[PDB]
Amino acid sequence: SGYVFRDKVMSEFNNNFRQQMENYPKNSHTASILDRMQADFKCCGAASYTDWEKIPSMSKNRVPDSCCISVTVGCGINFNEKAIHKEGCVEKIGGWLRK
């Protein structure tokens, strides 16, 4: 019942971002695109980094390496909370889709 946005185009971009998060571990091509957005915009997940805890095939206590403040190979495996971006991506990436 609750919704993060009211505009139709903004809420559908939000679901599109969350949909490709589900396809992150099922496709390497999909995962590479999201790694750029999370790296360039310095963010993790849709609204928070804790969104990854709900993604199947995403290991426990693991976030994508692009979520780390400094992107190194394997930095997301057994990550530390103080070494990743906690803020989500949806608002800062597509906020201009609001009315």
Partner 1 sequence: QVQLVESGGGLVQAGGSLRLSCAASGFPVASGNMAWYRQAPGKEREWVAAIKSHGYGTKYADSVKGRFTISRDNAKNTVYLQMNSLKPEDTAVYYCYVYVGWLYWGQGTQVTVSA
Residues of the shown chain interacting with partner 1 in the complex, contacts defined by CB under 8 A: 1-4, 6, 18, 45-51, 54, 81, 86-88, 90
Alpha carbon 12 to chain centroid, angstroms: 16
Query: To the nearest whole angstrom, how small is the minimum distance from the Cβ of residue 28 to partner 1?
Result: 25
Q: Which is nearer to partner 1, 13 or 49 (CB)?
A: 49
**10 Å Cβ neighbour count for 23?**
14
Q: Which is nearer to partner 1, 18 or 42 (CB)?
A: 18
Q: Which is nearer to partner 1, 2 or 29 (CB)?
A: 2
- Report how far residue 63's alpha carbon sits from residue 59's, in angstroms, rounded to the nearest whole number: 8
Q: Which residues pair with 62 in a beta bridge?
A: 77
